[PDB]
Amino acid sequence: TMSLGAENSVAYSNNSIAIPTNFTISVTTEILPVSMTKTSVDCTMYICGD
Amino acid sequence: CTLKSFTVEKGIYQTSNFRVQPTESIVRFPNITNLCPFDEVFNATRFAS
Ligand SMILES: *[C@@H]1O[C@H](CO)[C@@H](O[C@@H]2O[C@H](CO)[C@@H](O[C@@H]3O[C@H](CO)[C@@H](O)[C@H](O[C@H]4O[C@H](CO)[C@@H](O)[C@H](O)[C@@H]4O)[C@@H]3O)[C@H](O)[C@H]2NC(C)=O)[C@H](O)[C@H]1NC(C)=O
Ligand SMILES: *[C@@H]1O[C@H](CO)[C@@H](O[C@@H]2O[C@H](CO)[C@@H](O)[C@H](O)[C@H]2NC(C)=O)[C@H](O)[C@H]1NC(C)=O
Ligand SMILES: *[C@@H]1O[C@H](CO)[C@@H](O)[C@H](O)[C@H]1NC(C)=O
């Protein structure tokens, strides 16, 4: 049976906050298609060959 | 006449093939070698009764 992910529990409580003190710079990629192959057909040549 | 009109706009058009090319006919077959023995029956000296 597949596992959705690692279990977690945030220690929520009023009059309590968490503040980061350091940072990290991340570079990520992303690929997107743009165009496909341009093609053409000849009707009579394909249907009735010579 | 492939767009079926008399006025064409600016651009590039992909036409068809209307030129006609004459053609001949040809036929080939193997070597006729194994003939039948017709001479023995049609050119026999004596025929049976
Ligand atoms: C039964 O037997 C008879 C007699 O044996 C046979 O008739 C003969 O057939 C041959 C077939 O070639 C004939 O020969 C031809 O004769 C003509 C003139 O009559 C010539 O012009 C021909 O010349 C051509 O062929 C040559 C090669 O043979 C070439 O060198 C030349 O350049 C030409 O292209 C050819 O010689 C012959 O004349 C007859 N004879 C008679 C009396 O009919 C008959 O066919 C036989 N029957 C069966 C069923 O086999
Ligand atoms: C914030 O994170 C950076 C990155 O890890 C820390 O820089 C490191 O500092 C230690 C000790 O000075 C070095 O040994 C590492 O080589 C450093 N990493 C680098 C330069 O990539 C930085 O110290 C952190 N800031 C705080 C306040 O903890
Ligand atoms: C904080 O949360 C507790 C429950 O965890 C509640 O009893 C209390 O009244 C809250 N106080 C304030 C000031 O929000």
Q: What is the dihedral of CA B1, B4, B8, B11, to 10 degrees?
A: -80
Please, are residues A44 and B16 in contact by the beta-carbon 8 Å criterion? yes
Q: Which residue has the tokens 């990629």?
A: A29
Collect all residues with Cβ–Cβ distance below 8 Å to A45 and sequence separation of at least 6.
B17
Q: How many CB pairs (< 8 A) connect A and B?
A: 7
Q: Is B40 in the pocket of ligand 1 (CB under 6 A)?
A: no
| Integer angstrom CA distances of residue B11 from B5, B8, B14, B16 | 15, 9, 10, 16
Q: How far is the CA of B18 from the centre of ligand 1 (A)?
A: 53
Q: Which ligand is nearest to the CA of B44?
A: 1
Resolution (A): 3.0
Tokens of B39: 């001479």
Q: How far is the CA of B35 from the centre of ligand 1 (A)?
A: 16
Q: Which residue has the tokens 């064409």?
A: B8
Collect all residues with Cβ–Cβ distance below 8 Å to A42 and sequence separation of at least 6.
B16, B17
